[PDB]
């Protein structure tokens, strides 16, 4: 693909509806642990092991410790230059009657913290719960999410499992339910929300420029969004630290950290 920043900027100056797809690279640049491919590890596992229905069915206490740890570290984490460039772009273009929407695979809410308003969080959020019995979804920012997890979730290898009885895990407060809560995060092998995908499809159908930022482009169906957009002739520009299996399908590829390339790109 092309690496002419000047050429991309010509499309950027004219674009009326920009879709920005962001993945784990953007969160890692804030120092958020992504637990995918260094990574690194939570004590002996990575996300592929614990973000699964199987892992939650076997040891929900261990999965909750993992998600509790991830919620807690967010206190020390701030949006990076990439998040800020993306949020400022949205505000600046919106004043010109131009639309910018972020479709993120990330679950850490740093895009919102940076001020992004048009946001589709297609894999859920560390700060939402869902009841495994009644299905209600709720926001939850409490540290710790439940008394039994207080001080738990330590990440060092060799840390014993908290082994919290399921009744002491986060419980639904819908009157009459009290079912066990899970993180409202899409796990490997689960389907994404059809209403969310309907929103995604509307944005993809109407955009005139697409950016793919910090994404490995091997997690589906998210890996396939940008290819359907190029079909209508829409330019796709990829911003990643390395090539991906989808790189040769894009109009532009700008190699490097997203917090380095995006400020120039979206200036």
């Amino acid at each position: 693909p092309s690496s002419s920043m000047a050429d991309f900027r010509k499309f950027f100056a004219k674009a009326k509806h920009i879709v920005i797809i962001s993945g784990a690279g953007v969160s890692a640049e804030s120092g958020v642990p992504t637990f995918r491919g260094a990574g690194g590890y939570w004590r002996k596992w990575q996300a592929q092991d614990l973000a699964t229905p199987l892992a939650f069915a076997h040891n929900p206490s261990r999965v909750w410790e993992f998600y509790h740890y991830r919620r807690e570290v967010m206190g020390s984490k701030e949006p990076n230059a990439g998040h800020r460039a993306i949020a400022e772009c949205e505000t600046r273009l919106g004043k010109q009657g131009r639309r910018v929407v972020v479709i993120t695979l990330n679950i850490d809410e740093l895009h919102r913290k940076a001020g992004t308003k048009n946001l589709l969080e297609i894999h859920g959020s560390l700060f939402k719960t869902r009841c495994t019995s009644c299905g209600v979804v709720a926001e939850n920012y409490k540290s710790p999410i439940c008394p039994a997890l207080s001080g738990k979730g330590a990440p060092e290898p060799g840390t014993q499992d908290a082994s919290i009885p399921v009744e002491k895990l986060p419980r639904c407060e819908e009157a009459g339910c009290g079912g066990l809560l899970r993180p409202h995060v899409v796990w490997f092998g689960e389907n994404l929300d059809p209403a969310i995908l309907e929103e995604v499809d509307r944005e993809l159908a109407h955009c005139d420029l697409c950016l793919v930022v910090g994404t490995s482009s091997v997690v589906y169906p998210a890996a396939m969004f940008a290819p359907q957009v190029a079909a209508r002739g829409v330019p796709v520009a990829e911003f990643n630290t390395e090539t991906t299996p989808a790189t040769n399908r894009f109009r532009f590829h700008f190699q490097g950290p997203c917090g380095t390339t995006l400020p120039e790109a979206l200036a």
């Binding site: 894999h123 796990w187 490997f188 389907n191 994404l192 589906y220 169906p221």
Partner: peptide, 4 residues
Amino acid sequence: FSKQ
């Protein structure tokens, strides 16, 4: 679609 399913998350891979």
